[PDB]
DNA sequence: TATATTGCGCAATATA
DNA sequence: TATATTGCGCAATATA
């Protein structure tokens, strides 16, 4: 078209598109700070589930040298 | 209208544009499907957690 | 009718 | 010389 209409169609979905590419590189922002944050409570219940195998082995052995 | 320099040089442009952006997409897909490996993966080790501790407080209880 | 989404072309820019 | 990167824009598509 290439008149009125059209450069104001154009103007209109420039902006737009600058928002949704701004909306896009902000949640992949996020997105990388969740990965940060749920690494570390990773990291936590890994050492957890380690802390509390290791409690449990060593009860399961202490009552396994029991006699009968 | 233009050289058969530019039209040749716009044409590798366009497919490594295209090669960059790819991987670019790839890499944030990436970066989002470890949220949900992590998600699943900490709901996992959360069950673990209640496990052992319902195993410590069963075989406790046998003491008496 | 409108905005939102996005692969693509372009050229300036960065890098090899 | 070359490819790699990327911020406008464009236009086809999706959506309201």
């Known amino acids: 078209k290439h008149s009125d209409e059209y450069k104001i169609r ?3 979905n420039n902006i737009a598109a600058r928002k949704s590419r701004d909306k896009a590189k902000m ?8 990965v940060l944050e749920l690494t570390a409570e990773n ?12 409690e449990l082995s ?10 009968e």
Request: aromatic share 4%; charged share 40%; no cysteine.
């Open 10 to 12: 154009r103007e209109r």
């Open 43 to 54: 990291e936590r219940l890994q050492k957890k589930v380690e802390q509390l195998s290791r």
């Open 27 to 34: 949640r992949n922002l996020e997105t990388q700070h969740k």
């Open 58 to 67: 060593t009860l399961r052995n202490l009552f396994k040298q029991l006699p």
